[PDB]
Amino acid sequence: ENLYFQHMKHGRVFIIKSYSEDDIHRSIKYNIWCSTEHGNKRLDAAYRSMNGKGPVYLLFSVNGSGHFCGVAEMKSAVDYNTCAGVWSQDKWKGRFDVRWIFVKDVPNSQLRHIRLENNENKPVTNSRDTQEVPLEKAKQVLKIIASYK
Ligand SMILES: O=c1[nH]c(=S)[nH]c2[nH]ncc12
Protein backbone atom coordinates (compact mmCIF):
# COMPACT_ATOMS: atom_id res chain seq x y z
CA GLU A 1 0.00 0.00 0.00
CA ASN A 2 1.26 3.44 -0.87
CA LEU A 3 -0.22 4.60 2.45
CA TYR A 4 2.91 3.25 4.14
CA PHE A 5 6.54 4.42 4.13
CA GLN A 6 6.12 7.13 1.49
CA HIS A 7 8.42 9.67 3.19
CA MET A 8 11.51 7.67 4.22
CA LYS A 9 13.94 9.91 2.35
CA HIS A 10 16.97 8.78 4.37
CA GLY A 11 17.70 5.88 6.64
CA ARG A 12 18.77 2.30 6.47
CA VAL A 13 17.25 -1.14 6.77
CA PHE A 14 18.67 -4.45 8.04
CA ILE A 15 17.49 -8.07 8.15
CA ILE A 16 17.38 -9.70 11.60
CA LYS A 17 17.51 -13.52 11.62
CA SER A 18 16.73 -15.06 15.02
CA TYR A 19 17.39 -18.61 16.27
CA SER A 20 14.66 -18.07 18.86
CA GLU A 21 11.02 -17.08 18.63
CA ASP A 22 11.16 -16.62 22.41
CA ASP A 23 13.76 -13.89 21.97
CA ILE A 24 11.46 -12.12 19.50
CA HIS A 25 8.59 -12.34 21.99
CA ARG A 26 10.78 -10.76 24.66
CA SER A 27 11.79 -8.06 22.18
CA ILE A 28 8.15 -7.23 21.43
CA LYS A 29 7.28 -7.18 25.15
CA TYR A 30 10.10 -4.88 26.28
CA ASN A 31 11.09 -3.06 23.05
CA ILE A 32 14.75 -4.15 23.14
CA TRP A 33 17.03 -6.28 21.00
CA CYS A 34 20.56 -7.67 20.85
CA SER A 35 22.54 -8.95 17.86
CA THR A 36 25.80 -10.81 17.27
CA GLU A 37 29.07 -9.15 18.21
CA HIS A 38 29.67 -8.08 14.60
CA GLY A 39 25.96 -7.33 14.11
CA ASN A 40 25.84 -5.05 17.14
CA LYS A 41 28.82 -3.09 15.81
CA ARG A 42 27.26 -2.77 12.34
CA LEU A 43 23.91 -1.56 13.70
CA ASP A 44 25.64 0.74 16.21
CA ALA A 45 27.63 2.47 13.45
CA ALA A 46 24.54 2.82 11.25
CA TYR A 47 22.49 4.31 14.10
CA ARG A 48 25.28 6.65 15.22
CA SER A 49 26.10 7.96 11.73
CA MET A 50 22.41 8.52 11.03
CA ASN A 51 22.46 11.04 13.92
CA GLY A 52 18.66 11.15 13.96
CA LYS A 53 18.41 12.20 10.30
CA GLY A 54 16.27 9.16 9.45
CA PRO A 55 15.08 5.75 10.68
CA VAL A 56 17.02 2.52 11.01
CA TYR A 57 14.47 -0.23 10.39
CA LEU A 58 14.86 -3.92 11.30
CA LEU A 59 13.03 -6.64 9.34
CA PHE A 60 12.63 -9.64 11.66
CA SER A 61 12.48 -13.31 10.69
CA VAL A 62 12.84 -16.54 12.67
CA ASN A 63 15.34 -18.95 11.10
CA GLY A 64 13.52 -21.78 9.32
CA SER A 65 10.05 -20.27 9.72
CA GLY A 66 9.43 -19.42 6.07
CA HIS A 67 8.02 -16.01 6.98
CA PHE A 68 9.01 -12.59 8.23
CA CYS A 69 7.38 -11.75 11.54
CA GLY A 70 7.51 -7.97 11.76
CA VAL A 71 9.30 -4.65 11.64
CA ALA A 72 10.89 -2.55 14.38
CA GLU A 73 12.77 0.74 14.43
CA MET A 74 16.09 1.09 16.23
CA LYS A 75 15.70 3.64 19.03
CA SER A 76 19.10 3.78 20.78
CA ALA A 77 22.79 3.09 20.42
CA VAL A 78 24.16 -0.26 21.59
CA ASP A 79 24.95 -0.69 25.27
CA TYR A 80 27.62 -3.37 25.43
CA ASN A 81 27.88 -3.98 29.20
CA THR A 82 24.47 -5.19 30.39
CA CYS A 83 22.92 -7.99 32.41
CA ALA A 84 24.14 -11.41 31.26
CA GLY A 85 21.93 -14.34 30.33
CA VAL A 86 18.65 -12.50 29.66
CA TRP A 87 18.12 -14.11 26.24
CA SER A 88 17.79 -17.68 24.97
CA GLN A 89 21.59 -18.03 24.84
CA ASP A 90 24.32 -16.46 26.95
CA LYS A 91 26.22 -15.45 23.78
CA TRP A 92 23.75 -12.58 23.11
CA LYS A 93 25.55 -9.77 24.96
CA GLY A 94 24.49 -6.14 24.99
CA ARG A 95 21.24 -4.33 24.34
CA PHE A 96 19.64 -1.55 22.33
CA ASP A 97 16.14 -0.12 22.32
CA VAL A 98 13.67 -0.71 19.53
CA ARG A 99 10.10 0.30 18.73
CA TRP A 100 8.03 -2.43 17.12
CA ILE A 101 5.84 -1.15 14.28
CA PHE A 102 4.36 -4.31 12.76
CA VAL A 103 3.95 -7.72 14.36
CA LYS A 104 2.59 -9.94 11.60
CA ASP A 105 3.62 -13.09 9.78
CA VAL A 106 4.26 -12.50 6.07
CA PRO A 107 5.09 -15.59 3.97
CA ASN A 108 8.42 -15.56 2.14
CA SER A 109 6.44 -16.19 -1.06
CA GLN A 110 5.32 -12.54 -0.95
CA LEU A 111 8.92 -11.28 -0.73
CA ARG A 112 11.23 -13.68 -2.58
CA HIS A 113 11.03 -11.81 -5.92
CA ILE A 114 12.89 -8.87 -4.33
CA ARG A 115 16.60 -9.32 -5.01
CA LEU A 116 19.52 -7.58 -3.29
CA GLU A 117 22.08 -6.02 -5.61
CA ASN A 118 24.56 -5.79 -2.69
CA ASN A 119 24.22 -9.55 -2.06
CA GLU A 120 24.89 -11.07 -5.49
CA ASN A 121 21.27 -10.48 -6.57
CA LYS A 122 20.03 -13.09 -4.08
CA PRO A 123 16.40 -12.98 -2.91
CA VAL A 124 15.91 -10.88 0.22
CA THR A 125 14.35 -14.00 1.78
CA ASN A 126 17.77 -15.73 1.57
CA SER A 127 19.56 -13.12 3.70
CA ARG A 128 21.69 -13.81 6.74
CA ASP A 129 21.45 -11.99 10.07
CA THR A 130 22.16 -8.20 9.81
CA GLN A 131 22.31 -8.20 6.01
CA GLU A 132 21.77 -4.58 4.97
CA VAL A 133 19.03 -3.93 2.39
CA PRO A 134 19.35 -1.27 -0.33
CA LEU A 135 16.90 1.52 0.45
CA GLU A 136 14.75 1.07 -2.65
CA LYS A 137 14.38 -2.68 -2.08
CA ALA A 138 13.75 -2.04 1.63
CA LYS A 139 10.89 0.30 0.76
CA GLN A 140 9.40 -2.49 -1.36
CA VAL A 141 9.64 -5.03 1.47
CA LEU A 142 8.29 -2.61 4.08
CA LYS A 143 5.24 -1.77 1.96
CA ILE A 144 4.50 -5.44 1.31
CA ILE A 145 4.72 -6.29 5.01
CA ALA A 146 2.66 -3.23 5.98
CA SER A 147 -0.21 -4.01 3.58
CA TYR A 148 -0.26 -7.82 3.73
CA LYS A 149 -3.59 -9.28 4.84
O1 LIG B 1 18.60 -15.88 18.34
C2 LIG B 1 18.91 -14.75 18.54
N3 LIG B 1 18.56 -14.13 19.77
C4 LIG B 1 18.92 -12.77 20.06
S5 LIG B 1 18.51 -12.11 21.47
N6 LIG B 1 19.65 -11.98 19.10
C7 LIG B 1 20.03 -12.61 17.81
N8 LIG B 1 20.69 -12.12 16.77
N9 LIG B 1 20.78 -13.09 15.79
C10 LIG B 1 20.17 -14.21 16.22
C11 LIG B 1 19.68 -13.93 17.52
Structural domain containing residue 138: 1-149
Resolution (A): 1.7
End-to-end CA separation in angstroms for the chain: 11
**In a 3-state reduction of DSSP, which class is residue 50?**
helix
What CATH number is associated with residue 118? Answer: 3.10.590.10
Pocket of ligand 1 (CB under 6 A): 17-20, 23, 34-36, 87-88, 92, 129
Q: How far is residue 18's CA from residue 28's CA, in Å, rounded to a whole number? A: 13
Quick one: how far is CA 42 from the chain centroid? Answer: 12
Buried-exposed string 14-23: b where 16+ CB fall within 10 A, e elsewhere: bbbbbeeeeb
Residue 113: exposed, middle, or buried by beta-carbon count in 10 A (0-12, 13-18, 19+)?
Answer: exposed
- Contact assessment for residue 137 and residue 122, using Cβ atoms and an 8 Å cutoff: no
* Cα angle, residue 46 at apex, residues 60 and 125 outer, rounded to 5°: 30
The number of distinct structural domains making up the chain is: 1
Q: How far is residue 93's CA from residue 37's CA, in Å, rounded to a whole number? A: 8
CA distances from 119 to 21, 31, 54, 90 (A): 26, 29, 23, 30
Query: How many angstroms separate the alpha carbon of residue 11 from the centre of ligand 1?
Result: 23
